[PDB]
Structure 1
Amino acid sequence: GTILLDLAPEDKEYQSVEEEMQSTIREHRDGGNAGGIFNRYNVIRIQKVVNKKLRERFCHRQKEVSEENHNHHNERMLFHGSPFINAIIHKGFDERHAYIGGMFGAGIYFAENSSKSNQYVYGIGGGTGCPTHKDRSCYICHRQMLFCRVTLGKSFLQFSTIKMAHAPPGHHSVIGRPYAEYVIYRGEQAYPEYLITYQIMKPE
């Protein structure tokens, strides 16, 4: 079963995670359509996800990757957002929920910019926004996103939309440029380390 560890605001770990989240906000091409208009989040809590089986499978895959990547995990901390957070923290990332016709195929997608991940909290293109107000820029409803350990191993660099089912032979991830999108094709190559609960904040 999943255990959530509550990080304290005065912990350096809490602070480093919020700072990564706050400092990687950027302007988006869609003018804020999907994720809303904001310059900063209000972080309500940050929780560390602890789950024995998810950790086991992550370690297990880590090893296989390292062997095919000159003994390097090539791990990176990256943001992920999607409507499936609650399932992810209990069951792990599941590539079976990926979509053909994703920009780089049926993978699980991660970003360096927290604001990119925030676009997907309510679905592709922000869906119809929060359940309560149908507002993709809702400043009331709480949102969650993940700050994850991602086993990239040997990344394939892609520069056009390609519909991949799996990383290319000898590879373990795809870094795609339509800003970079980090894509894995196996759920066990990501661990949902930090669960961040937050609101976007209305600019003054």
Structure 2
Amino acid sequence: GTILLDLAPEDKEYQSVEEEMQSTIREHRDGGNAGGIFNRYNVIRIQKVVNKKLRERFCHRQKEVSEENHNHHNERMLFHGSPFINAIIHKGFDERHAGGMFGAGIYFAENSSKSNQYVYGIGGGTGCPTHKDRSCYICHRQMLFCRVTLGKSFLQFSTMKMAHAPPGHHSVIGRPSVNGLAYAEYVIYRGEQAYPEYLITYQIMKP
């Protein structure tokens, strides 16, 4: 099954992942309601996720997408927050579990703070299980930093609800715009198009 390999804080790989997590924090339109109020995280640990079966499905799909995109799979490393991270690291992403702006897909953010708004559910739900606080500064949260095969992407500023990527395409990118999205989002419609590469355990920090 799945093996988690702990990254040391002195490793350049650990440092690269933390830097991407910290530097992509942005100012949210809800004032912190969903994800909590913070300017930085406290990273507890970063683990590499190893799953032979998930890797095989991912690599198989990556080759199909590369062939349909002029031999370029076009991967991006993107964040994913979910109260179901334990199932994802064992079973992978599953599009069958997909109100989304781009329809029935699997969603990722390039801004870690956007994925953080989803760690405890839509709008943060009732927050951490122990204290029922969306802004809990004690409980450890988890998010994934994933390899996402975008292939030939379809870029949009406004909502476009679909069941699958458009013909010939492999993903949908929602870009920010005035009167549109605040931050980008990336959507795939096949679970095998993402690999949950890193598992980050963290706390948000009180300003």
* TM-score normalised according to structure 2 size: 0.95
CA distance in structure 2 between the aligned counterparts of 1:73 and 1:11, rounded to whole angstroms: 28
Q: Percent identity?
A: 100
Shift of 1:23: 0.6
CA distance in structure 2 between the aligned counterparts of 1:155 and 1:20, rounded to whole angstroms: 22
* TM-score normalised according to structure 1 size: 0.97
CA distance in structure 2 between the aligned counterparts of 1:125 and 1:162, rounded to whole angstroms: 22
Shift of 1:130: 0.7
The CA deviation string for residues 17-56 of structure 1, in whole angstroms up to 9 with x for no partner, is: 0011011101001110100000110000000000000000
SS of 2:128 mapped into structure 1: coil
SS of 1:129 mapped into structure 2: coil
Shift of 1:187: 0.5
Equivalence for 2:179 = none
Shift of 1:160: 1.6
Query: Structure 1: 5+ residue runs without aligned partners?
Result: none
The CA deviation string for residues 152-181 of structure 1, in whole angstroms up to 9 with x for no partner, is: 000001222122111101000000136211
Whether 1:131 and 2:129 are equivalent positions in the alignment is yes
SS of 1:4 mapped into structure 2: strand
SS of 2:25 mapped into structure 1: coil
CA distance in structure 2 between the aligned counterparts of 1:158 and 1:130, rounded to whole angstroms: 34
SS of 1:147 mapped into structure 2: strand
Q: How many residues align?
A: 201
1:12-23 map, 5 Å: 12-23=12-23
Which 10-residue stretch deviates more, 114-123 or 152-161? 152-161
Instruction: Give the RMSD, CA atoms, in angstroms.
Output: 0.8
One of 161, 164, 172 as aligned partner of 2:159: 161
Query: Structure 2: 5+ residue runs without aligned partners?
Result: 177-182
Shift of 1:103: 1.1
Shift of 1:188: 0.5
CA distance in structure 1 between the aligned counterparts of 2:125 and 2:4, rounded to whole angstroms: 28
Shift of 1:94: 0.8
CA distance in structure 1 between the aligned counterparts of 2:166 and 2:174, rounded to whole angstroms: 13
CA distance in structure 2 between the aligned counterparts of 1:60 and 1:85, rounded to whole angstroms: 23
CA distance in structure 1 between the aligned counterparts of 2:175 and 2:74, rounded to whole angstroms: 19
SS of 2:37 mapped into structure 1: coil
Equivalence for 2:205 = 201
Shift of 1:149: 0.3
SS of 2:123 mapped into structure 1: helix
The CA deviation string for residues 70-111 of structure 1, in whole angstroms up to 9 with x for no partner, is: 01010000111111100000000111111xx21111111111
The CA deviation string for residues 52-77 of structure 1, in whole angstroms up to 9 with x for no partner, is: 00000000000110011001010000
CA distance in structure 1 between the aligned counterparts of 2:172 and 2:90, rounded to whole angstroms: 26
CA distance in structure 2 between the aligned counterparts of 1:176 and 1:39, rounded to whole angstroms: 24
